Design an enzyme around this catalytic site. Structure first.
Site, mmCIF file in Angstrom:
data_model
loop_
_atom_site.group_PDB
_atom_site.id
_atom_site.type_symbol
_atom_site.label_atom_id
_atom_site.label_comp_id
_atom_site.label_asym_id
_atom_site.label_seq_id
_atom_site.Cartn_x
_atom_site.Cartn_y
_atom_site.Cartn_z
ATOM 1 N N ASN A 1 0.770 -1.207 -0.127
ATOM 2 C CA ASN A 1 -0.091 -0.057 -0.146
ATOM 3 C C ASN A 1 0.846 1.260 0.092
ATOM 4 O OD1 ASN A 1 0.703 0.196 2.636
ATOM 5 N ND2 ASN A 1 -1.243 0.083 3.491
ATOM 6 N N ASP B 1 -1.508 -8.821 -9.309
ATOM 7 C CA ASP B 1 -2.379 -9.779 -9.183
ATOM 8 C C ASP B 1 -3.772 -9.148 -9.195
ATOM 9 O OD1 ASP B 1 -1.584 -8.324 -6.570
ATOM 10 O OD2 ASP B 1 -3.263 -9.204 -5.601
#
Ligand SMILES: [Cl-]
Ligand SMILES: [Cl-]
Ligand SMILES: [Cl-]
Length: 196
Positions: A73, A98
């Protein structure tokens, strides 16, 4: 700097540490590490850019590789200054990640769009905009949303891993097109992949 839509920076998203290396959220790391081995690009420590990075020749083109070591993040804390320092425009960047919205064994090349809920892309798009390319590596969805951390931070069962591994291998074979700027052909050939 970069030049047109020849891909000259390939980023793989993931989390650092052995505890995350086999998890689905590291699919982008898998692709970039495999690409680096294929082409003999050294992925070395890059403290300045909070990552591991390399530079070398892919099919006659000077290409940089980057794995942020920020935690997912905070990926933009690596990608943004790195791309800026080397004068790499978004249009010359490929980010492998992903993709919860695609099945294991599905892989697609996309240009543009938002983060799709991905907490790494969420840290990048605000800074450089959306106009970079993405290698969306399907991982499946857990069903519910309170539960996304559990799925992406899980280690896939063997059948799903095999499906992802085959898709990633296919994509490695198409990087030559990408570094040559043949984005349309690469998109067609990547997106047509089937596992069986
Ligand atoms: Cl995460
Ligand atoms: Cl897509
Ligand atoms: Cl994407």
């Amino acid at each position: 700097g970069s030049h047109m839509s020849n891909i000259s920076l390939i980023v793989g998203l993931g989390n650092p540490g052995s505890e995350y290396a086999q998890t689905r959220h590291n699919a982008g790391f898998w692709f970039v590490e495999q690409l680096a081995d294929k082409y003999g690009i050294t992925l070395k420590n890059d403290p300045k850019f909070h990552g591991i990075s390399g530079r070398g020749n892919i099919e006659g083109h000077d290409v940089r590789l980057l794995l942020p070591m920020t935690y997912m993040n905070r990926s933009g804390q690596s990608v943004v200054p790195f791309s800026k320092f080397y004068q790499i425009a978004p249009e010359a960047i490929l980010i492998a990640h992903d993709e919860l919205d695609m099945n294991p064994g599905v892989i697609r090349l996309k240009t543009g769009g938002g983060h799709g809920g991905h907490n790494g892309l969420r840290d990048i798009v605000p800074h450089i905009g959306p106009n970079f390319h993405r290698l969306r590596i399907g991982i499946g969805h857990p069903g519910s949303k309170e539960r996304v951390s559990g799925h992406v931070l899980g280690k896939a069962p063997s059948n799903e891993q095999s499906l992802m591994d085959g898709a990633i291998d296919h994509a490695l074979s198409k990087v030559k097109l990408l570094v040559q700027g043949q984005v349309p052909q690469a998109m067609n050939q990547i997106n047509a992949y089937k596992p069986a």
